[PDB]
Amino acid sequence: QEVDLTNCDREPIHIPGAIQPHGVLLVLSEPGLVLTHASENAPAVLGNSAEQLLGAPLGHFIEPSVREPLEADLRSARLKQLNPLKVVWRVDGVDRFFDGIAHRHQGRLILELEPSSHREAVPFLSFFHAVRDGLSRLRDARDLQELCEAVVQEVRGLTGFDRAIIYRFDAEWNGSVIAEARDARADPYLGLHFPASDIPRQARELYQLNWLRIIPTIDYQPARVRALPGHGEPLDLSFSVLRSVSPIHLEYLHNMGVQASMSISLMKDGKLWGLISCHQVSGTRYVPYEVRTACEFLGEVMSSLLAAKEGNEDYDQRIRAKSIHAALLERMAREVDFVSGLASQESGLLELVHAHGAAIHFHGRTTVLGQAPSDEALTGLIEWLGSRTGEGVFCTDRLAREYPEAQAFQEVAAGLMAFSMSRGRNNFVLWFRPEAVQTVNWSGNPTKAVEFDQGGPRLHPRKSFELWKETVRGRCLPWKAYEVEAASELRRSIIDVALQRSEEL
Amino acid sequence: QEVDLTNCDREPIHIPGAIQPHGVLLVLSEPGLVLTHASENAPAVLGNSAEQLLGAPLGHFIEPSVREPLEADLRSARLKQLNPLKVVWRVDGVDRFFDGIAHRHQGRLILELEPSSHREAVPFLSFFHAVRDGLSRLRDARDLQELCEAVVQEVRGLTGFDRAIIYRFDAEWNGSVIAEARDARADPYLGLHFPASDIPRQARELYQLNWLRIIPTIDYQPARVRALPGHGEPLDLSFSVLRSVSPIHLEYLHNMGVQASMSISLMKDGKLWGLISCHQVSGTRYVPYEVRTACEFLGEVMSSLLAAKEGNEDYDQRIRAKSIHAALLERMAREVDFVSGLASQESGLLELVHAHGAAIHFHGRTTVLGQAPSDEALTGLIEWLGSRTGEGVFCTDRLAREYPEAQAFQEVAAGLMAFSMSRGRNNFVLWFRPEAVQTVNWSGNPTKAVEFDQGGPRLHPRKSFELWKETVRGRCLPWKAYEVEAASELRRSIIDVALQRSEEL
Ligand SMILES: */C=C/C1=C(C)C(=O)N/C1=C\c1[nH]c(Cc2[nH]c(/C=C3\NC(=O)C(C=C)=C3C)c(C)c2CCC(=O)O)c(CCC(=O)O)c1C
Ligand SMILES: */C=C/C1=C(C)C(=O)N/C1=C\c1[nH]c(Cc2[nH]c(/C=C3\NC(=O)C(C=C)=C3C)c(C)c2CCC(=O)O)c(CCC(=O)O)c1C
Query: What's the CATH number where B82 sits?
Result: 3.30.450.20
Task: Tell me, yes or no, whether A344 and A326 share the same domain.
Answer: yes
Burial label, B142 (beta-carbon count in 10 A; 0-12, 13-18, 19+)? exposed
With left for phi above 0 and alpha for psi between -120 and 50, is residue B27 left, alpha or beta?
beta
d(CA A357, CA A98): 67
- In order of A324, A378, A381, the CA distances from A429 in angstroms are 17, 12, 12
Under DSSP, the state recorded for A449 is S
d(CA B77, CA B81): 10
Contact in structure between B469 and B440 (CB atoms under 8 Å): yes
Interface test with B, best of A303, A306, A499, A504 (most B CBs within 10 A): A499
- In order of A91, A115, A285, the CA distances from A98 in angstroms are 13, 5, 17
Q: What's the gap in Å between A193 CA and the centre of ligand 1? A: 14
Amino acid sitting at position A343: A
Residue of minimum CA distance from atom 19 in ligand 2: B198
Cis amide bond preceding B434, omega within 30: no
d(CA B219, CA B244): 12
Q: Tell if the CB–CB gap between A300 and B504 is shorter than 8 Å.
A: no
Q: How far apart are the first and last CA of chain B?
A: 53
Contacts of A137 in chain B (CB under 8 A): 81
Q: How far apart are the first and last CA of chain A?
A: 44
Resolution for the entry shown, Å: 3.2
Please give the full DSSP string across B354-377, using - where no structure is assigned.
T-SEEEEEETTEEEE-SS---S-T
User: What H or E segment, with its residue span, contains residue B494?
Assistant: helix B481-503
User: What H or E segment, with its residue span, contains residue A77?
Assistant: none
d(CA A355, CA A294): 47
Contact in structure between A462 and A255 (CB atoms under 8 Å): yes
Ligand nearest to the CA of B448: 2
d(CA A248, CA A265): 21
User: Which CATH number characterizes residue A195's domain?
Assistant: 3.30.450.40
Output phi, psi for B41, to 5 deg. -70, 15
d(CA A145, CA A131): 20
Contacts of B125 in chain A (CB under 8 A): 290
Among B246, B266, B284, the domain-final residue is B246
In DSSP terms, A469 is beta-bridged to A441
- What number of other Cβ atoms are within 10 A of residue A456's Cβ? 8
Amino acid sitting at position B494: I
Task: Tell me, yes or no, whether A79 and A201 share the same domain.
Answer: no
d(CA B54, CA B70): 19
d(CA A166, CA A145): 10
d(CA A53, CA B46): 62
Please give the full DSSP string across A291-345, using - where no structure is assigned.
HHHHHHHHHHHHHHHHHHHGGG---TTTHHHHHHHHHHHHHHTT-S-SHHHHGGG
Q: Tell if the CB–CB gap between B290 and A132 is shorter than 8 Å.
A: yes
CB within 8 Å of B66: residues ≥ 6 apart: B86, B87, B88
Angle at the Cα of A51 (from A45 to A56), degrees rounded to 5?
A: 90
Output phi, psi for B479, to 5 deg. -80, 120
Q: What's the gap in Å between A363 CA and the centre of ligand 1? A: 53
Distance of CA A318 to the CA centre of its chain: 28
Under DSSP, the state recorded for A83 is P
Task: Tell me, yes or no, whether B465 and B325 share the same domain.
Answer: no
Task: Tell me, yes or no, whether A242 and A255 share the same domain.
Answer: no
Helical axes B481-503 vs B317-334, angle rounded to 10°? 20
Q: Tell if the CB–CB gap between A81 and B133 is shorter than 8 Å.
A: yes
In DSSP terms, A262 is beta-bridged to A214, A278
d(CA A193, CA A169): 10
Amino acid sitting at position B216: P
Task: Tell me, yes or no, whether A332 and A413 share the same domain.
Answer: yes
Output phi, psi for B452, to 5 deg. -115, 175
Contact in structure between A369 and A353 (CB atoms under 8 Å): no
CB within 8 Å of B220: residues ≥ 6 apart: B20, B21, B22
- In order of B65, B252, B446, B461, the CA distances from B191 in angstroms are 55, 20, 15, 21
Ligand 1 pocket, residue A211 CB under 6 Å = no
Measured CB to CB, residues of chain B less than 8 Å from chain A are 78, 80-83, 119, 121, 124-125, 128-129, 131-133, 135-136, 139, 290, 293-294, 297, 300-301, 304, 391, 421-424, 426, 492, 495-496, 498-500, 502-504
Please tell me the total count of domains within chain B: 3
Output phi, psi for B338, to 5 deg. -60, -30
Please give the full DSSP string across B74-85, using - where no structure is assigned.
TTSS--TTT-SE
Ligand nearest to the CA of A16: 1
d(CA B210, CA A436): 45
- In order of A224, A318, A480, the CA distances from A315 in angstroms are 56, 5, 11
Among chain A residues, CA nearest to B492: A492
Distance of CA A376 to the CA centre of its chain: 42
d(CA B380, CA A321): 35
Contact in structure between A398 and A475 (CB atoms under 8 Å): yes
Q: What's the gap in Å between A7 CA and the centre of ligand 1? A: 14
CB within 8 Å of A131: residues ≥ 6 apart: A294, A297, A298, B128
Of B81, B131, B424, the CB nearest to A140: B81
CB within 8 Å of A141: residues ≥ 6 apart: A147, A150, A305, A309
Strand residue runs (E) in B160-247: 163-169, 175-182, 193-194, 212-215, 223-227
CB within 8 Å of A140: residues ≥ 6 apart: B78, B80, B81
Q: Tell if the CB–CB gap between A135 and B297 is shorter than 8 Å.
A: yes
d(CA B210, CA B213): 8
Ligand nearest to the CA of B280: 2
User: What H or E segment, with its residue span, contains residue B331?
Assistant: helix B317-334
Output phi, psi for A253, to 5 deg. -65, -25
In DSSP terms, B181 is beta-bridged to B164
- What number of other Cβ atoms are within 10 A of residue A413's Cβ? 20
Nearest-CA distance B97 → chain A (Å):
17
d(CA A52, CA A496): 78
Sign of CA dihedral A18, A19, A23, A27: negative
Q: Among candidates B139, B493, B216, which has minimal Cα distance to B329?
A: B493
Ligand 2 pocket, residue B250 CB under 6 Å = no
CB within 8 Å of B128: residues ≥ 6 apart: A131, A294, A297
Task: Tell me, yes or no, whether A48 and A25 share the same domain.
Answer: yes
Among B246, B262, B291, the domain-final residue is B246
User: What H or E segment, with its residue span, contains residue A200?
Assistant: none
Under DSSP, the state recorded for A24 is E
d(CA B27, CA B110): 5
Helix spans in A76-143 (H): 124-140
SS3 B318: helix
Q: Among candidates A81, A114, A84, A130, which has minimal Cα distance to A216?
A: A114
Please give the full DSSP string across B239-283, using - where no structure is assigned.
T-SSBPPPHHHHHHHHHTT-SEEEEEEEEETTEEEEEEEEEESSS
Contact in structure between B242 and B19 (CB atoms under 8 Å): yes
d(CA A478, CA B2): 42
In DSSP terms, B432 is beta-bridged to B357, B416
Task: Tell me, yes or no, whether A252 and A158 share the same domain.
Answer: yes
Output phi, psi for B503, to 5 deg. -40, -40
Task: Tell me, yes or no, whether B407 and B272 share the same domain.
Answer: no
Half-sphere exposure of B74 (CA within 13 A, CB side): 28
Beta-strand pair A394-395/B439-443: unpaired
Residue span of the structural domain in which A35 resides: 12-124+221-246
Under DSSP, the state recorded for A40 is T
d(CA A133, CA A155): 12
d(CA A134, CA A157): 10
CB within 8 Å of A441: residues ≥ 6 apart: A191, A192, A193, A467, A468, A469, A470
Task: Tell me, yes or no, whether B6 and B107 share the same domain.
Answer: no
Contacts of A297 in chain B (CB under 8 A): 128, 131-132, 135
In DSSP terms, A91 is beta-bridged to A94
Nearest-CA distance A61 → chain B (Å):
27
Task: Tell me, yes or no, whether B139 and B173 share the same domain.
Answer: yes
Ligand 1 atom at minimum distance from A277 CA:
22
Q: Tell if the CB–CB gap between B499 and A502 is shorter than 8 Å.
A: yes
Q: Tell if the CB–CB gap between A424 and B304 is shorter than 8 Å.
A: no
In DSSP terms, A193 is beta-bridged to A176, A442
Contact in structure between B54 and B226 (CB atoms under 8 Å): yes
- In order of A402, B98, B473, the CA distances from A472 in angstroms are 17, 59, 67
d(CA B432, CA B370): 9
Contact in structure between B57 and B70 (CB atoms under 8 Å): no
Contact in structure between B241 and B289 (CB atoms under 8 Å): yes
Please give the full DSSP string across A336-398, using - where no structure is assigned.
S-SHHHHGGGHHHHHHHTT-S--EEE-SS-EEE-SS---TTTHHHHHHHHHSS---S-EE-S-
SS3 B41: coil
Output phi, psi for A488, to 5 deg. -60, -35
Burial label, B117 (beta-carbon count in 10 A; 0-12, 13-18, 19+)? exposed
Ligand 2 pocket, residue B249 CB under 6 Å = yes
Task: Tell me, yes or no, whether A329 and A268 share the same domain.
Answer: no
Contacts of B422 in chain A (CB under 8 A): 496, 499-500, 503
Among B207, B226, B246, the domain-final residue is B246
Q: Among candidates A28, A47, A56, A26, which has minimal Cα distance to A38?
A: A26
Amino acid sitting at position B304: S
In DSSP terms, A278 is beta-bridged to A164, A262
Contacts of B294 in chain A (CB under 8 A): 135
Q: Residue count of chain B, please give it.
A: 505
d(CA A44, CA B475): 76
Please give the full DSSP string across B109-143, using - where no structure is assigned.
EEEEEEE-----HHHHHHHHHHHHHHHHHHHT--S
B337-340: list long-range contacts, CB under 8 Å, 24+ apart. B338/B494, B338/B497, B338/B498, B338/B501, B339/B367, B340/B367
d(CA A273, CA A169): 6
d(CA B348, CA B330): 12
User: What H or E segment, with its residue span, contains residue B416?
Assistant: strand B415-420
Task: Tell me, yes or no, whether B425 and B323 share the same domain.
Answer: yes
Among chain B residues, CA nearest to A296: B132
SS3 B424: coil
Residue of minimum CA distance from atom 34 in ligand 2: B263
Rg of chain A (C-alpha set)? 29
